[PDB]
Design a protein around this nucleic acid. Structure first.
Ligand SMILES: COC(=O)C[C@](O)(CCCC(C)(C)O)C(=O)O[C@@H]1C(OC)=C[C@]23CCCN2CCc2cc4c(cc2[C@H]13)OCO4
Ligand SMILES: [Mg+2]
Ligand SMILES: [Mg+2]
Ligand SMILES: [Mg+2]
Ligand SMILES: [Mg+2]
Ligand SMILES: [Mg+2]
Ligand SMILES: [Mg+2]
Ligand SMILES: [Mg+2]
Ligand SMILES: [Mg+2]
Ligand SMILES: [Mg+2]
Ligand SMILES: [Mg+2]
Ligand SMILES: [Mg+2]
Ligand SMILES: [Mg+2]
Ligand SMILES: [Mg+2]
Ligand SMILES: [Mg+2]
Ligand SMILES: [Mg+2]
Ligand SMILES: [Mg+2]
Ligand SMILES: [Mg+2]
Ligand SMILES: [Mg+2]
Ligand SMILES: [Mg+2]
Ligand SMILES: [Mg+2]
Ligand SMILES: [Mg+2]
Ligand SMILES: [Mg+2]
Ligand SMILES: [Mg+2]
Ligand SMILES: [Mg+2]
Ligand SMILES: [Mg+2]
Ligand SMILES: [Mg+2]
Ligand SMILES: [Mg+2]
Ligand SMILES: [Mg+2]
Ligand SMILES: [Mg+2]
Ligand SMILES: [Mg+2]
Ligand SMILES: [Mg+2]
Ligand SMILES: [Mg+2]
Ligand SMILES: [Mg+2]
Ligand SMILES: [Mg+2]
Ligand SMILES: [Mg+2]
Ligand SMILES: [Mg+2]
Lengths: 109, 201, 175, 190, 139, 252
RNA sequence: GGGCCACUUUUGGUAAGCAGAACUGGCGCUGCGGGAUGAACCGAACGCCGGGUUAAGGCGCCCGAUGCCGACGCUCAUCAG
RNA sequence: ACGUCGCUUUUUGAUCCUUCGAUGUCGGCUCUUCCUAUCAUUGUGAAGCAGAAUUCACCAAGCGUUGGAUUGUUCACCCA
RNA sequence: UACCAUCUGUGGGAUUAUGACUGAACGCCUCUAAGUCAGAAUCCCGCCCAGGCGGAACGAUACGGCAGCGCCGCGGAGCCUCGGUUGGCCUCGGAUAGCCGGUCCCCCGCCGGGGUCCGGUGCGGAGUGCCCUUCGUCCUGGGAAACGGGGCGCGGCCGGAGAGGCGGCCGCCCCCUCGCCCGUCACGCACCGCACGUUCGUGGGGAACCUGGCGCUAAACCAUUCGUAGACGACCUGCUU
């Protein structure tokens, strides 16, 4: 019961104009739209859950078709919210405009 | 939040709304822009009409069947302004542009829904009132659009049904102001809890 | 010369004492600058034009900020200045309303750039003093000289245009 | 420089009684009623008195070009008051040299036909703006007499029948023919 | 139209800035954009504030222009604003919007139970005021 | 550089894609503007070209060269047997155009009208409108047509009449009729749709649709010539006789 | 042992993305960030990478960044900028 | 008029940047499109515009701008 | 096949120059500043030509003895494949130098419509909002409910056409006194700190299999013809009464 994670959007990689750095993601989180409003999310854990064809092993259950790339939030990118994230393996480019779950893990409250 | 965003286009500026829409479009967010008849463009009419007439002159003389497609219906004029604000030569920007559905007037998927407003794009907020403004529905009519007269007769009869639904929604709202006057001694405990925590002024 | 909020500096200097005059005369200026570094560098700009005095044959005796004597009463500042255009140079007289002296001179630099495209290296403020209300001449200053000022704020334009960005109700401008 | 306040009151006689639907003046006199929407100029209007009934219009921080529209709205209201207390009578006179001009009045005064203009066979049929009673006088020999309450409709209808009778491809110093506005009067000399 | 004016003694409410949420009095008008502005009883020292930060109220204090602080203070206390304000609806909507932000997770549960019950009694009689109020049998 | 001698362009650009027509009857593409003040009538008809003839008549043009004198005009003859009203169709007007709303074909559709609905009449089993003819003789299939003839009354603005020709009365080899929508102008929508079932299964002659001595418009498909060169198709100037690769070309 | 460009100085020429000198830096031999694009301009020179911060330039959308309740003015252009 | 400020690239020069392991070179014929710096035609303003004729401007390139003698001619010139 | 014969060739709209109207700024004047008018071989559309990797309405939809197909079932058993998503908002028109909400006398078959009055307006009858709100059952008491809830119960009717693919109302039933708040009373895998859990969802799509019930029995192309057509394709036609 309950959603229990806050919802974010994968907007793009860390980039200039004619270069990009795929090791850092840029996330838009709903509700927070200021830089002085985003220190809550400043170290929270985040994830990209996706489904594929083959069954894979699941922690706590029998094998399903959902696979997850895990990451965390490092710091803020700009003035209008917009945290930047760092995942373990770099995000696939098909995930631009898709759901990233900000998970309320390690807490400071 | 994966519902559709529905925007009443009346009273908005053309590119001020287009820049807002074309960034939400890139972030998922299926958005539907209804009532393009009433989108405004800053500057006076004749000046803005000359911009569109100057566009009509751009034409591949070798074969104008292959050249620029000069859409004349307001919905497709607004569809082209956001096209130029999207990377529509890539699959990210073509899957983006499929999320925007543009309509003239308000079709019956969206006539019985609530429309959102963008205050950063409205004519009353972003123009000084001692300026001039053109209507996108009017400069489509003198440019070649066929259907402002059937759209006017279908928006008049929709506003006939909108007054009827409102006067029934407004009639139930003065029933709740009568019910809360009758059964109030039995909600004195419940109306004080909500009054304590920032509700029920 | 840049800007951003101008102070006012009392800069005092004199020529280094050679065996010609053992005590050369002290000179002082009032200088509106962002900080005392610029105030000591604009001092040797004018005192080299007024007197035959350079920085190597001279020293800054006293540099220091001049604070406003009454920053809580509204004063009429008439400013005599001197700038150069794309054509030749011109003299002017402008009037402002401000609480501080250095605030009405900041207000002059933004208004000489707005109306005349005069950059701050072009402008030379030479005199600034507190004009009374009965000696003002400019009509924009004199319209606020009424003991019964009364006006509304007619067309309040919405500033929070993005909080929220998408709302369901159209805003109000009558308050 | 933007002037903080520029007002101009407008006196109102006893036979009229005007109201304000925002920026919409509705003047109602013994000769009918008029109505103009002023929702393109940002001023505030105000009925002040209850015995003499003044009408003030403010401007509140307008520049030089906005400040010009304070006295015009006064002049539009004063043309509504004279329109419904007195009216607008335009006596206008036909000036011919060789060919006399025949003007026959068609249906209820809202249409004129100008036939014998410089001896040409074309018939000029120009429609009146609605509310203008164009007629032919009897104390003069050939002059038109058009009534009405709205000065932007009476003078426009008088300008339709003046732009229609223009001489083309000739000198206009000689060939002084046409129907011209002679005198702008009122009915019921106050 | 136009009833709330800027004048000498107009009590203004500051909407944003360093003094957001303070009532304050207008002392003098500094050239179309700024105003000499002093709140002697709401802890706001005399300074210049733009007219875009402030929002005009209904209350007007009487004192001459550019008067000292002690004369705008005993004019604040005669017809005392701090009991006139915090009795009007706009003052009540401010305190009944910040105490919704001061609402703990257990307070939010108690509103969730009290609202869900209160929307059962109100929902009940609006049926009884539309099925007994439709009892009409007249030509 | 310029040409030095002005000459008009050969051919219109307003008639071109000069392809084979994608049809054979002749699409109307524009019916006469309709206004309710008139009586209720048809606006088009459909006939076959039979051949030409010249006639002799005298002229009444007062002031002309040939007033009260007898001239020889060339005429053509169009065989027009009466068209049979076989159906009805109503259109609703939309901001995207003018879409078709509902059509109601009649019972007792003839075999020459059903011939059109088959590309091969020999091997077919003639089954067209055999499920649809039984809802004219039913109870709970009946009143859905009076729900079809009532929604098309209250929602449509333009109703048309599907009519076909009757080939059995002509000297041609083909027995397949030509169906055609012909709109009904002059009148309100509730009258023109009541009118167009009175005529349903009945014939209308050309005497009703078109009267004496009025001008009409003729819509058809040109006599076909085949693949032709630029001298036949565009009537360009031929090239001089000592041209190497071809006289009947366009040079530049 | 064919050079070329740029600031300033300078010769012939009406002028030239012309021809010829002086001085320094550059391009050629050299990629990178910005100038949309471009041998030379602006910043800065390069082993392979992770974190931080800047330069010149930017920050409605394309397209990273003002979704600041930015400050004060000027400007309406039926070829604006 | 004396002076003086421009535009243009339908003239001719100036330059040598591209092309010498090739980009077919004057004129005509033919054919399409474009430009306006408008000869005519549509709508107008001005005249030392009485009419007729002509002239100077303006929005304007929609539409038209021919048939020949001589010359390879582009140009030129006469006939109609 | 030929100006070498014959026939046909069209209507608006916004406006440019320009001429004006009302009319300020500049207490006079002024085509202009706000607001208007007349206006053309131009421009744009119609007429005309073509008809989108654009829609629509409608027709018929595969058998003579093993053969298919469509609809109505949560009717089943499970496979595969494509992915997304994690509660809803079911709607006045609009004004912005003003609005929203209640209301007395009056009138267009008792809704609407008006001018007084009464409140609200940094919108609180508020999207900065609102509605839902998910631990489970069992014991047991008090309140809200009694003009209640529930079902793919069937029939019955009405409203919705701009892309209606929907939204309400009903007569006979069916069990139910539970579900909403404040409490009593205890139990459930309490899986022994730990991830993809929580939904939409009985998802879309391609198959094949079993078991009921209800209906349906076609065309297109080739070949052959035709010559209103044509390089070839295509196109226009005909083929047991
Ligand atoms: C004296 O000049 C000639 O003989 C011309 C020709 O020989 C033409 C070549 C035709 C062939 C022989 C290839 O059939 C030739 O090689 O022309 C060059 C030639 O050959 C195609 C191309 C040149 C050089 C590059 C482009 N330009 C175009 C034509 C041209 C025209 C000239 C010209 C030179 C070119 C040259 O001199 C004056 O007029
Ligand atoms: Mg799933
Ligand atoms: Mg898994
Ligand atoms: Mg001091
Ligand atoms: Mg928002
Ligand atoms: Mg006047
Ligand atoms: Mg003449
Ligand atoms: Mg040529
Ligand atoms: Mg030519
Ligand atoms: Mg040969
Ligand atoms: Mg060498
Ligand atoms: Mg050398
Ligand atoms: Mg050189
Ligand atoms: Mg060289
Ligand atoms: Mg080197
Ligand atoms: Mg380098
Ligand atoms: Mg670069
Ligand atoms: Mg550039
Ligand atoms: Mg440098
Ligand atoms: Mg780095
Ligand atoms: Mg950029
Ligand atoms: Mg961005
Ligand atoms: Mg060369
Ligand atoms: Mg060569
Ligand atoms: Mg070649
Ligand atoms: Mg070659
Ligand atoms: Mg021109
Ligand atoms: Mg002329
Ligand atoms: Mg042309
Ligand atoms: Mg010869
Ligand atoms: Mg011919
Ligand atoms: Mg017209
Ligand atoms: Mg005038
Ligand atoms: Mg004009
Ligand atoms: Mg007009
Ligand atoms: Mg077209
Ligand atoms: Mg009130």
């Amino acid at each position: 019961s309950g959603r229990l994670w806050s919802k974010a959007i994968f907007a793009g990689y860390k980039r200039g104009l004619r270069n990009q750095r795929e090791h850092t993601a840029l996330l838009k989180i709903e509700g927070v739209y200021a830089r002085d409003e985003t220190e809550f999310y400043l170290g929270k854990r985040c994830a990209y859950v996706y489904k594929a064809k083959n069954n894979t092993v699941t922690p706590g259950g029998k094998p399903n078709k959902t696979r997850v790339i895990w990451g965390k939030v490092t710091r803020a990118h700009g003035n209008s919210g917009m945290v930047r994230a760092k995942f373990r393996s770099n995000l696939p480019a098909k995930a631009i405009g898709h759901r990233i779950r900000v998970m309320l893990y390690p807490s400071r409250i | 939040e994966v519902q559709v965003l529905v925007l009443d286009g009346r009273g908005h500026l053309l590119g001020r709304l287009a820049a807002i829409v074309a960034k939400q479009v890139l972030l998922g967010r299926k958005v539907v822009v209804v009532r393009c008849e009433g989108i405004n463009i800053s500057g006076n009419f004749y000046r803005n009409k000359l911009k569109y007439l100057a566009f009509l002159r751009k034409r591949m003389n070798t074969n104008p069947s292959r050249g620029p497609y000069h859409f004349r219906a307001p919905s497709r004029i607004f569809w082209r302004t956001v096209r130029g604000m999207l990377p529509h030569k890539t699959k990210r920007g073509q899957a983006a542009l499929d999320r925007l559905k543009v309509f003239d007037g308000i079709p019956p998927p969206y006539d019985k829904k609530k429309r959102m407003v963008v205050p950063a794009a409205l004519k009353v907020v972003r123009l000084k009132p001692t300026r001039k403004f053109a209507y996108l529905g009017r400069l489509a009519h003198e440019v070649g659009w066929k259907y402002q007269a059937v759209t006017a007769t279908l928006e008049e009869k929709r506003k006939e049904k909108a007054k009827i639904h409102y006067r029934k929604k407004k009639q139930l709202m003065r029933l709740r102001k009568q019910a809360e006057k009758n059964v109030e001694k039995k909600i004195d405990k419940y109306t004080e809890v909500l009054k304590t925590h920032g509700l029920l002024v | 010369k840049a800007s951003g909020t101008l102070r006012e500096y009392k800069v005092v200097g004199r020529c280094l004492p050679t065996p010609k005059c053992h005590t050369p005369p002290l000179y002082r200026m009032r200088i509106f600058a962002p900080n005392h570094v610029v105030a000591k560098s604009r001092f040797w700009y004018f005192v080299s034009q007024l007197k035959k005095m350079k920085k190597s044959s001279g020293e800054i005796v006293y540099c220091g900020q001049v604070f406003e004597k009454s920053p809580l009463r509204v004063k009429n500042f008439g400013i005599w200045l001197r700038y150069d255009s794309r054509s030749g140079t011109h003299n002017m007289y402008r009037e402002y309303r401000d609480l501080t002296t250095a605030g009405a001179v900041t207000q002059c630099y933004r208004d000489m750039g707005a109306r005349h495209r005069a950059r701050a290296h072009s402008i030379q403020i030479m005199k600034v003093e507190e004009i009374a209300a009965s000696k003002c001449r400019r009509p924009a200053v004199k319209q606020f000289h009424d003991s019964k000022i009364k006006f509304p704020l007619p067309h309040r334009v919405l500033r929070r245009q993005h909080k929220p960005r998408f709302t369901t109700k159209r805003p109000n401008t009558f308050f | 420089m933007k002037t903080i306040l520029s007002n101009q009151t407008v006196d109102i006689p006893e036979n009229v009684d005007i109201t304000l639907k925002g920026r919409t003046v509705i003047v109602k006199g013994p000769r009918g009623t008029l109505r103009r929407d002023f929702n393109h100029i940002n001023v505030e209007l105000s009925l002040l008195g209850k015995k003499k009934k003044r009408l003030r219009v403010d401007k509140w921080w307008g520049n030089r070009k906005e400040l010009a529209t304070v006295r015009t709205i006064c002049s539009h209201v004063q043309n509504m008051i004279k329109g419904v207390t007195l009216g607008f009578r335009y006596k206008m006179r036909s000036v011919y040299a060789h060919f006399p001009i025949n003007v026959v009045i068609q249906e209820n005064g809202s249409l004129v036909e100008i036939r014998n203009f410089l001896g040409e066979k074309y018939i000029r049929r120009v429609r009146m703006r609605p509310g203008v009673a164009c007629s032919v006088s009897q104390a003069q020999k050939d002059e038109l007499i058009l009534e009405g309450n709205d000065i932007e409709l009476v003078s426009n209808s008088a300008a339709l029948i003046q732009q229609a009778t223009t001489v083309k491809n000739k000198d206009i110093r000689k060939f002084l023919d046409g129907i011209y506005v002679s005198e702008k009067g009122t009915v019921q000399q106050a | 139209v136009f009833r709330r004016f800027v004048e000498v003694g107009r009590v203004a409410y500051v909407s944003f800035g360093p003094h957001a949420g303070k009532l304050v009095a207008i002392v003098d008008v500094i050239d179309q954009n700024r105003a000499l502005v002093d709140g002697p009883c709401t802890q706001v020292r005399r300074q210049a504030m733009p007219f875009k930060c402030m929002q005009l109220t209904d209350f007007i204090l009487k004192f001459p222009h550019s008067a000292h602080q002690k004369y705008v203070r005993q004019a604040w206390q005669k017809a005392d604003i701090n009991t006139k304000w915090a009795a009007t609806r706009w003052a009540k909507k401010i305190e009944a919007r910040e105490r919704k932000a001061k609402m703990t997770d257990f307070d939010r549960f108690k509103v969730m139970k009290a609202k869900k019950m209160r929307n059962r009694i109100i929902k009940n009689e609006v049926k009884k005021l539309q099925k007994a109020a439709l009892l009409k049998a007249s030509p | 550089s310029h040409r030095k001698f002005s000459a008009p362009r050969h051919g219109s650009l307003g008639f071109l894609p000069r392809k084979r027509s994608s049809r054979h009857r002749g699409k109307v593409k524009s019916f006469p503007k309709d206004d309710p003040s008139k009586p209720v009538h048809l606006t088009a008809f459909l006939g076959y070209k039979a051949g030409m003839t010249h006639i002799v008549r005298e002229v009444d043009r007062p002031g002309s060269k040939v007033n009260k004198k007898e001239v020889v005009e060339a005429v053509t003859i169009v065989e027009t047997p009466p068209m049979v009203v076989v159906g009805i169709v109503g259109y609703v007007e939309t901001p995207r155009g003018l879409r078709t709303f509902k059509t109601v074909f009649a019972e007792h559709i003839s075999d020459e009208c059903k011939r059109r609905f088959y590309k091969n009449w020999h091997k077919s089993k003639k089954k067209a409108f055999t499920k649809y003819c039984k809802k004219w003789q039913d109870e709970d299939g009946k009143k859905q047509l009076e729900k079809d003839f009532s929604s098309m009354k209250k929602y449509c603005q333009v109703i048309r009449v599907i009519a076909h020709t009757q080939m059995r009365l002509l000297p041609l080899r083909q027995k397949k009729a030509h169906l055609m929508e012909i709109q009904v102008n002059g009148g309100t929508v509730a009258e023109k749709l009541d009118w167009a079932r009175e005529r349903l299964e009945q014939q209308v002659p050309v005497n009703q649709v078109f009267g004496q001595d009025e001008m009409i418009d003729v819509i058809g498909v040109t006599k076909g010539k085949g693949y032709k060169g630029v001298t036949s198709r565009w009537h360009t100037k031929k090239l001089p006789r000592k041209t190497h690769r071809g006289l009947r070309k366009v040079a530049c």
